[PDB]
Amino acid sequence: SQMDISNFYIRDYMDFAQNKGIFQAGATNIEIVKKDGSTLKLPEVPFPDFSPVANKGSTTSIGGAYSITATHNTKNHHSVATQNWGNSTYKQTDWNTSHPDFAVSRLDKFVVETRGATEGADISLSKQQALERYGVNYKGEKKLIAFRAGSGVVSVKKNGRITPFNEVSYKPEMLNGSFVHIDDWSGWLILTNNQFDEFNNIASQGDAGSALFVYDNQKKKWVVAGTVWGIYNYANGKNHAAYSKWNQTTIDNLKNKYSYNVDMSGAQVATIENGKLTGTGSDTTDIKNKDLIFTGGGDILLKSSFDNGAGGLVFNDKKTYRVNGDDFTFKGAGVDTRNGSTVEWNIRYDNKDNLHKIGDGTLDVRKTQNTNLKTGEGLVILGAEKTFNNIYITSGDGTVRLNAENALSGGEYNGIFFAKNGGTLDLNGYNQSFNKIAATDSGAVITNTSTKKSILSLNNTADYIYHGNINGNLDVLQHHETKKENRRLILDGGVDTTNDISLRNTQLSMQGHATEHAIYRDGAFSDYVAGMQNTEADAVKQNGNAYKTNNAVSDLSQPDWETGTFRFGTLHLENSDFSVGRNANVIGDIQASKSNITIGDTTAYIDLHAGKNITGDGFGFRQNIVRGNSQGETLFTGGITAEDSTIVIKDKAKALFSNYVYLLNTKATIENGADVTTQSGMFSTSDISISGNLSMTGNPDKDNKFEPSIYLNDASYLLTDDSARLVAKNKASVVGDIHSTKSASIMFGHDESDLSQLSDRTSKGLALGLLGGFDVSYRGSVNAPSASATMNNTWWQLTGDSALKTLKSTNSMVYFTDSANNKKFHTLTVDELATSNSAYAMRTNLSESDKLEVKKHLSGENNILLVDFLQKPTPEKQLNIELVSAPKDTNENVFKASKQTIGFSDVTPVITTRETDDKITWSLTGYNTVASVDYKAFLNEVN
After folding, report:
1. How far apart are CA 31 and CA 496, in angstroms?
2. What is the set of domains in the chain, with CATH numbers?
């Protein structure tokens, strides 16, 4: 544990050993960011799972009740005589040692926290064979590189200067490691160079016994090469850690010595009474301190209580067994169900001791135990009411299935505690109510594999973060009778169902998870955490990253978060607050009533005990929520139906409304930097305020085309910022007035070059109906005198007096028309109009008309003026109705009279051009007679 912190952080070496930060088990292409900003690529291997390494580092699990270490630590060493993994304590019963310094320990219980490093390296391989079998690519070469972790006395080295932390040895929190080069493989001891390159961490006193791991090509599996014997220092600063090789036979002899085979092939019933095993092919009068290894299937009968000492119960074939015995009890190392064995457990485990379950098989518990389970592997069926008082699930490999009504216990957690990497609780058709789920990370899964639906109620009484997952066939419910402050439910793990979540009088946040890192000391305080912090105050000062050395598992200001994917059918909101914070990917529909929805909440939540929530012996839960500003990108995708609600989409948030949005008396706001795309239609009764980006498009089908979509606002689109952007394109029919005090942008239609096609789903009748042959229909007035509008391939049904700063119309029709109760003529007022290949269709009753007024600049070629004659003109009256008004220098050919009729008139307009001293104008000064509408067809006249 002598760490060169010249170009790396102390926490990097800790994260490495502890599978925290970037060093997740199995991860490839890991890059350590140096203090100088550049990157160090790890060797090309799936990163090792270091869970076999004991809390103190000097001992390592090799599976079951066995661990390996260094003989010269001694039988009595505090890290050998007692050995810990997670919240569990294990006592050494004895050990077997082989020269030079290799020790294998027999423990008193089956270790549930880890499968262990079950296999060793083949030390009989030659140099070259070993390089081929165990070599890994590093800086473009195959090298015999090994990985390891330990917690010998800590010191740090910066550019030569060593700073020791003499008290700091065997500190679980300080577990640290490195990848190292094996300089000597075939020699008497394996010799590793821990400073062969850059990530340099030399072994120090207390690292003795810690394991060396190498990666097997063929087995695709990390295996143990040896245990730390000692350390050599040579002239000119060279250094090796020396390793006592894995000795398979020392292991096998100890294992066999602590095993006793019981052959029940055909031999009816195994009976155990006061330490005597009868009725089998392997009868004896003890049988104590030995794993009983059962084969052949069948019944085990206790005629007395059975304390097997350090020995456990092992089942070693894919057969079924039954353990019966009055009200007698078992005590020992636990139950190891191997090779798919099924054990129907119909006795009680000792009431003052924890049952340890490992093995890939099944423990089917048929009666109430009145004691605790610790499980790490395979299946446990809870077949009785209150099967266990408490359950501790660790490592990720274990599953607990409810198979009875009322199967869990009471209290805040229902007696379920998910420790490191958790495991799966299968509700299996039964409903459960938790006040809180005591889970420490995202490895905790609550699910339901039954075809019968189950309901998971969460009733947390104060603020609380659930780190786990909710999967499978379950609905989620959080209902309170009154809405109170200070009991928010925060999900920062995940949800993955096709079912519903129901919220009533409550507050819910969905959120990503701040990645957990190693810390120096768990708890407050002379002070080594302060000293270590001061060693890197220079680096922190330079890189502005105080979170990195603050002795906190995570921090609101850190950049590394894990996305929370929340997939569900419908989220039902009744008088509730729903928030999506940073780094979420929410995928589902929302139905909201009297509710507040916030997408892009700047408040995020972190748990200062994340990853270390499970306390004591495994059956307590701690959590310390910190909250504050922490912005980051986030996503919602789906539909929303909202009544009497408010919706806010905030900065960095992207909302893809891929289903219908229905806003009934709901206040909707899209803020600066927020991005909303709606593609499956909308209805709104109230104003939508847009300071960011609202894009309204048709529905993209499977074949690169668009089904028309309708955007119906009975109120107004309010553009509330200079930076606002309202976009409609790709087969969208929009209805509703636009108002803006600001210099926002409006963009209707696809880009001139970039055409889009109709879905084969859509009949041509419907298409003409909603779009008039154009890409976009817009119906409403626009009063945004400072705003810019761009319209291409657009049908503007202009239904009221309108005002823009600048307007550009290419291949569009501005169609002046009426509504329910207008029936008045309208005026389009613009500072600058650039118009080409477009049509303007004005109505007239032969004295007034719709009118276009361009105040400052009118440019563009090839536009027609259509006139809807609402009354049949006669040859008597002198017509002289101003249709368009523009500045003097405008070219008269910008507009021409159409030779087509529009409306119910058989009459074509005659338009004449005039120059007053300040404005040129187009006036209707005559007419000509000709003896679901496709309005795009009109534009043929102007190509």
Report:
1. 30
2. 1-258+513-562 (2.40.10.120), 259-512+563-943 (2.160.20.20)
